[PDB]
Structure 1
Amino acid sequence: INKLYSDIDPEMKMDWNKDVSRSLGLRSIKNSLLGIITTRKGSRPFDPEFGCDLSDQLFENMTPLTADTVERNIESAVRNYEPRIDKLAVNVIPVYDDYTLIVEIRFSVIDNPDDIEQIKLQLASS
Structure 2
Amino acid sequence: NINKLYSDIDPEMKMDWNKDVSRSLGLRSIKNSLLGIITTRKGSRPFDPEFGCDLSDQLFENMTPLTADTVERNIESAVRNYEPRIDKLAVNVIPVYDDYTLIVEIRFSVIDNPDDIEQIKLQLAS
TM norm structure 1: 0.77
Q: Give yes or no for contact 2:53–2:74 (8 Å, CA) kept in 1.
A: yes
Q: Deviations over 1:70-94 (max 9, x none)?
A: 1100011111011000101001111
Shift, 1:64, TM fit: 2.3
SS of 2:105's equivalent in the other structure is strand
Shift, 1:59, TM fit: 1.7
Shift, 1:8, TM fit: 38
Alignment length (residue pairs):
125
Give aligned-pair identity as a percent.
100
Q: Deviations over 1:87-116 (max 9, x none)?
A: 010011111111001110000000111111
How far apart in 2 are the matches of 1:109 and 1:25? 9
Unpaired segments of 5 or more residues in structure 1? none
Deviates more, 1:55-64 or 1:28-37: 55-64
TM-aligned CA distance change 1:11 to 1:86, over 3 Å: farther
Unpaired segments of 5 or more residues in structure 2? none
Q: Give yes or no for contact 2:42–2:53 (8 Å, CA) kept in 1.
A: yes
2:114 paired with 1:113: yes
Greater C-alpha radius of gyration? 2
The structure in which a higher percent of residues are helix is 2
How far apart in 1 are the matches of 2:9 and 2:52? 20
1:33 maps to: 34
TM norm structure 2: 0.77
